[PDB]
From a paper:
Caspases belong to a highly conserved family of cysteine proteases that have essential roles in programmed cell death, inflammation, differentiation, neuronal development and axon pruning. In addition to being activated by initiator and effector caspases, Casp6 can be activated by a unique intramolecular self-cleavage mechanism due to its longer intersubunit linker. Excess neuronal active Casp6 is associated with Alzheimer disease (AD) neuropathology and age-dependent cognitive impairment. By investigating the activity of four rare natural Casp6 variants (Casp6-A34E, Casp6-E35K, Casp6-A109T, and Casp6-T182S) and employing X-ray crystallography along with molecular modelling, we have identified a putative allosteric pocket on mature active Casp6.
Following our previous work, which described rare natural Casp6-R65W and Casp6-G66R variants with significantly impaired activity, we examined four additional missense rare variants with single amino acid substitutions located remotely from Casp6 active site: Casp6-A34E, Casp6-E35K, Casp6-A109T, and Casp6-T182S. A34, E35, A109, and T182 are not conserved in 12 human caspases and in Casp6 from different species. To assess the effect of mutations on Casp6 structure and function, we solved apo mature crystal structures of Casp6-E35K and Casp6-A109T but crystallisation attempts were not successful for the two other Casp6 variants. Casp6 variants were catalytically active against Ac-VEID-AFC but Casp6-A34E, Casp6-E35K, and Casp6-T182S, displayed lower activity than Casp6-WT in enzyme concentration-dependent manner whereas the activity of Casp6-A109T was comparable to Casp6-WT. Casp6-A34E, Casp6-A109T, and Casp6-T182S did not show significant changes in kinetic parameters, KM, and kcat, for Ac-VEID-AFC hydrolysis compared with Casp6-WT, whereas Casp6-E35K displayed slightly reduced kcat and consequently showed ~2-fold reduced catalytic efficiency kcat/KM. In addition, E35K substitution disrupts a salt bridge between E35 from the large subunit and K284 from the small subunit of the same Casp6-WT protomer, possibly further destabilising a functional oligomeric state of Casp6. The Casp6-A109T crystal structure did not reveal any significant changes around the mutation site, supporting our findings that A109T substitution does not have a significant impact on Casp6 activity.
Residue numbers in the entry:
A (entry chain A), B (entry chain A): 30 to 163, 197 to 261, 266 to 292
Write the structure that this text describes.
């Protein structure tokens, strides 16, 4: 009775919520390519997730009191009619040590809220966290899919006005193959595209190697919703 | 010219070497189910990898001076004719703090030897590390596939005379689908089988959730060699 092609059933009325979180709290000063690239990432992400059928919410940690309200409300919501949940963590490239340390606490809080014990509404439903990296950054959970812009011990290359290499290469793959390929198959393409995107500065010969940790159990497809 | 179905070319004359490493150095005393289960794992693994076409070598850290010889020789070998490399780390369930700390150092050494800079013979060839878990256990590298018996913050359940849940459920999937399915697809089945294998002791209601971190870039297939 064991099925090697079993998929997470994406038949529910709602696809789910796509949370786009921007880490901007303690970045002391921003160049315009830094201000412009994070915006292109939020918009390119909002487009691609909306096309697959996601409800998109964008938050910033600049509004400290609003944040606790915004994070709590989304956690309390029930996802019984949702197929899956998606969270995206956007962080700037070169920040101070407090900015990066705050990033670790926020990722550990966000992933912790949707664990099996804390979110019965998402049990057996995939929880997809896409993290853009800068005392741990590697958590776990059942039916979780953790996607990192850069693996441990690898460098991430500077943000541009067009955006970030990981995001833009993810969005382009989502637009071309969002409904076509399985998500792990799609992310494997992002790994090759970003790694092959090997590119005036003192960082010559360096490649950005993305990574995804999968605790999923069934195949993940995003066939056109209806 | 971008191909969404591109695979690592498995046409080379040799498939590669399958390294089965047994961590037995500082385990102070062993019950017979502990002595018997690790043996069933080594043998069930040797069978399944040999069928796919792997050269199997088994090492133990009990022979301290032999170990440095054995680890070094395999690292120096050239894998130009090999398709891929596979390493398996077998550790006992409940050990002391030194046994587990030695496990971290050995995994960090083994994975470090086959990084892109240290093994030109395996550049662009997949490096597959299957770790049975017990100051870090999460390393990285290009074209690496890290497979863990249990994710972080999850418990692994005791070894039996038949073997370990992760290994036996991996071998059974390898025998049925070793040549059929893609490796990441195959490991996704191991995640479901072990997690569904929810099972008299004080650990009631606990599930073992496996995990795999993928830095691969192309699809991985093990079609019958010839």
């Amino acid at each position: 009775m064991f099925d090697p092609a079993e998929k997470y059933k994406m038949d529910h009325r709602r696809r789910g919520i796509a949370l786009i979180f921007n880490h901007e709290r303690f970045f002391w000063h921003l160049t315009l390519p830094e201000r412009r690239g994070t915006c292109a990432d939020r918009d390119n992400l909002t487009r691609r997730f909306s096309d697959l059928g996601f409800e998109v919410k964008c938050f910033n940690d600049l509004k400290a009191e609003e944040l606790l309200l915004k994070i709590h409300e989304v956690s309390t919501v029930s996802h019984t009619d949702a197929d899956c949940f998606v969270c995206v963590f956007l962080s700037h490239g070169e920040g101070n040590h407090i900015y990066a340390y705050d990033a670790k606490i926020e990722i550990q809080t966000l992933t912790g809220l949707f664990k099996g014990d804390k979110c019965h509404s998402l049990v057996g439903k995939p929880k997809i966290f896409i993290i853009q990296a800068c005392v741990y950054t590697l958590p776990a959970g059942a039916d979780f899919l953790m996607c990192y812009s850069v693996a441990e011990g690898y460098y991430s290359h500077r943000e541009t006005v067009n955006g970030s290499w990981y995001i833009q290469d993810l969005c382009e793959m989502l637009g071309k193959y969002g409904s076509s390929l399985e998500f792990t198959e799609l992310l494997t393409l992002v790994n090759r595209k970003v790694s092959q995107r090997r590119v005036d500065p003192s960082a010559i010969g360096k490649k950005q190697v993305p990574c995804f940790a999968s605790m999923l159990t069934k195949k993940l497809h995003f066939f056109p919703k209806s």
